[PDB]
């Protein structure tokens, strides 16, 4: 019986998660253990660099967060949360945290390097994915949300920008600052405009169903090449989202449109993933009839697309940035705020 096997698997996974949540790892490397290779990304309070571990030669992505900037932009809780989640979860489609540490100036999260880069750039380059291609990625997100929701985590950050494609063509989910434990409801206005469920926009108390809405947005964008609700300004996007109207490209299959009508459902009593049968309403939908869910989880399905890779440290799938210093102050900054990191 697969159902009993899934229940046992998820109960074991929850025990392991809670153990690691209660006793997080800390201070498992230091900066001079690494050589910097290239800046892979920049943000308002941090950067991501390709680094090489001097002792082993292994490549990693090092997320470097400026503590003072985190404090300025009110991201203390999100940043502490991301690291605590990353060191506690364990699932094939979630990025792996290898080391973490801090110094006078910065917080550091060292993760396995995924040279294939973001789904976003591959999607924009190719234009759109065929439905079998979109379905392959969609299935991995379904299973990832089944795992996260079983831990009572709402993800709240789904978009192609936050999905990496690894060397076997499978997805790695990257970001967890917004992942909150919610057994009941929560209220924060957060996410990315195109991916916000209507109940978030309408300032309602909301739950894990917002992730299944976001899955609908992701599937639509992957298959069409553009998201279902867009406009010049976020407020105009929000008006479209809450309207309950959506149009589909003529090349969308009937099965795809039916799935999307049930995921992009403004009424929570009708949205797939939020009904009595839960995720099984999605897994058993006709669009997924050819999906071997166990084989996806085991990464035994041949990926439809493998990114170009010329070595463990190739950076060709990432943008080019001006290389700036990593300055570490002589004075400790914000020590109390980040004591638990």
């Amino acid at each position: 019986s697969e159902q009993e096997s899934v229940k046992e698997f998820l109960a074991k996974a929850k025990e392991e998660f809670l153990k690691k949540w209660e006793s997080p790892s800390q201070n498992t490397a230091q900066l001079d253990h690494f050589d910097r290779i290239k800046t892979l990304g920049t943000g308002s309070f941090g950067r991501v660099m390709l680094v090489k571990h001097k002792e082993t030669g292994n490549h990693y992505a090092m997320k470097i967060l400026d503590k003072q900037k985190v404090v300025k932009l009110k991201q203390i809780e999100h940043t502490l949360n991301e690291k605590r989640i990353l060191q506690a979860v364990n699932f094939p489609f979630l990025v792996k945290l290898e080391f973490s540490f801090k110094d006078n100036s910065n917080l550091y999260m060292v993760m396995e390097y995924v040279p294939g880069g973001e789904m976003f750039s591959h999607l924009r380059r190719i234009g759109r994915f065929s439905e079998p291609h979109a379905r392959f990625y969609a299935a991995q997100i379904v299973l990832t949300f089944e795992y996260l929701h079983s831990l009572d985590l709402i993800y709240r950050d789904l978009k192609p920008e936050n999905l990496l494609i690894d060397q076997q063509g499978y997805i790695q989910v990257t970001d967890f600052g917004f992942a909150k434990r919610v057994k009941g409801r929560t209220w924060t206005l957060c996410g990315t405009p195109e991916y916000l469920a209507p109940e978030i926009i309408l300032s309602k108390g909301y739950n894990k169903a917002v992730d299944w809405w976001a899955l609908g947005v992701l599937i639509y964008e992957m298959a069409a090449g553009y998201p279902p609700f867009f406009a010049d300004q976020p407020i105009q996007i929000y008006e479209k989202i809450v309207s309950g109207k959506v149009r589909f490209p003529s090349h969308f299959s009937s099965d795809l449109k039916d799935l999307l009508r049930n995921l992009l459902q403004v009424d929570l009593t009708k949205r797939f993933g939020n009904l009595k049968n839960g995720v099984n309403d999605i897994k058993n939908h006709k669009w997924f009839a050819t999906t071997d869910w166990i084989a996806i989880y085991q990464r035994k399905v041949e990926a439809p697309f493998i990114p170009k890779f010329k070595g463990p440290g190739d950076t060709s799938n990432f943008d080019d940035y001006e290389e700036e210093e990593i300055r570490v102050s002589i004075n400790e900054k914000c020590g109390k705020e980040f004591t638990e990191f």
């Binding site: 976003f120 990315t192 406009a231 010049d232």
Partner: peptide
């Protein structure tokens, strides 16, 4: 086309969280 309208929206690059 709808694609053209998407390009006209200007939100074709990486999107920030609110």
């Amino acid at each position: 086309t709808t694609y053209a309208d998407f390009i006209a929206s200007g939100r074709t690059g990486r999107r920030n969280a609110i």
